[PDB]
């Protein structure tokens, strides 16, 4: 079970790390946009991967979002394949 | 069944607390920060851990951030084993 | 060492166009951002615009008028900032600085005197 | 977008005094303010980032403060070496502006 979770925990922090640099990219050129610094991007990724997401950073251009979605969904995908996997091994 | 849930139903109040903690010990020394004062920062951990995190606080330093990541995830897989457990039993 | 090259001077006349250059040194990242500084004798700093060499693209500030297109050139780490159609307004220095996405401009380059005369 | 007013424009001051420069935002933006130092015919140089955040190379007699819209950036006991135009910059919301500037004067 150590494989199942194992490989999503991957594709999360790859997700995290590429969506934290791609919401700066398209985040910035767009007056008022906050998420345009890499640290703060990465907290931003984290806590939407989470899907907590307390709304003191979101995205509010297109590609953001875009990014957004692909983080949200890789997200939820992964943490509930670990649980599904840390579930049943018990 | 009553145990690999009883066993995060553990943890998950250990990290509240020691989160409540460490988020008051990180946050403090942040000008602006809100996060500052124990009560307040339980009820942080505890919408972050379930997730919810209305925004009305949230940490803006970075090991203020890592217990944050560290109580959302002990959250996610919580909650998650016992809905796991609840619903097998079921 | 030094970080950013910047030519000392650029001398244009009305209506040219001129394209500085600015050739970096040191540590590189992809996360690194070059931006371009405007600065009128007497005046403070203004703002032109800023690129990810790592990427290419590029933003510039939308309250002034759009003299300049950036483009970079990731082999030999030089940046180029291209000014079009030149007037007495245009001339000044013109700095480039890297900031490492994180926010703040931590080195800056010797800045370029530009010069728009006949 | 953001607006950083830097009043007064010139701080007259005596050798050895504290002065303090401040910077107001047009709008709340946390902590994400820095500060530059430019001589006559020089550069801006970083002297503070993120408000309080110290630089290395840079005399201890300088220091940040505040959060918000409002900034203070200090200079323990000013010296001649001190003379120069200082500058605020913030990296809150795109994109990123500058203040108009502070000359300091012995």
């Known amino acids: 079970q150590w494989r199942a979770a194992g490989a999503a925990t991957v594709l999360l922090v790859i997700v995290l790390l590429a969506g934290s640099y791609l919401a700066v990219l398209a985040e910035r050129g767009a007056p008022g946009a906050q998420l345009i610094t890499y640290p703060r991007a990465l907290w931003w990724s984290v806590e939407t991967a989470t899907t907590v997401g307390y709304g003191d950073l979101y995205p509010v251009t297109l590609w953001g979002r875009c990014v957004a979605v692909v983080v949200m969904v890789a997200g939820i995908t992964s943490f509930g394949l670990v649980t599904a996997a840390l579930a049943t091994w018990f | 069944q009553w145990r690999a849930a009883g066993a995060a139903t553990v943890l998950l109040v250990i990290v509240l607390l020691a989160g409540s903690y460490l988020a008051v010990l990180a946050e403090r020394g942040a000008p602006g920060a809100q996060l500052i004062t124990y009560p307040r920062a339980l009820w942080w951990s505890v919408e972050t851990a379930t997730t919810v995190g209305y925004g009305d606080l949230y940490p803006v330093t970075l090991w203020g951030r890592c217990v944050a990541v560290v109580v959302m995830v002990a959250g996610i897989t919580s909650f998650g084993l016992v809905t796991a457990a609840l619903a097998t039993w079921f | 060492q030094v970080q950013l090259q910047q030519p000392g001077a650029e001398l244009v006349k009305p209506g040219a166009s001129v394209k500085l250059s600015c050739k970096a040194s040191?540590?590189?990242?992809?996360?690194?951002?070059i931006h371009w500084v405007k600065q009128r004798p007497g005046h403070g700093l203004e703002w032109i615009g800023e690129?990810?060499?790592?990427?290419?693209?590029?933003n510039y500030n939308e309250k002034i008028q759009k003299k300049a297109t950036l483009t970079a050139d990731k082999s030999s780490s030089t940046a180029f900032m291209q000014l079009s159609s030149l007037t007495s307004e245009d001339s000044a220095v013109y700095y480039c600085?890297?900031?490492?996405?994180?926010?703040?401009?931590?080195?800056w380059g010797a800045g370029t005197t530009v010069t728009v005369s006949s | 977008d953001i607006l950083l007013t830097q009043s007064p424009a010139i701080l007259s001051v005596s050798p050895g005094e504290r002065v303090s420069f401040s910077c107001r935002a047009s709008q709340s933006i946390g902590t994400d303010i820095h500060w530059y130092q430019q001589r006559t015919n020089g550069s801006p140089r970083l002297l503070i980032k993120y408000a309080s955040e110290s630089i290395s190379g840079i005399p201890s007699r300088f220091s940040g403060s505040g959060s918000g819209t409002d900034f203070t950036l200090s200079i323990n006991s000013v010296e001649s070496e001190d003379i120069a135009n200082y500058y605020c910059q913030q990296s809150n919301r795109w994109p990123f502006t500058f203040g108009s500037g502070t000359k300091l004067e012995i």
């Open positions: 040191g540590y590189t990242f992809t996360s690194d951002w």
């Open positions: 600085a890297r900031e490492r996405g994180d926010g703040y401009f931590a080195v």
């Open positions: 690129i990810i060499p790592s990427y290419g693209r590029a």
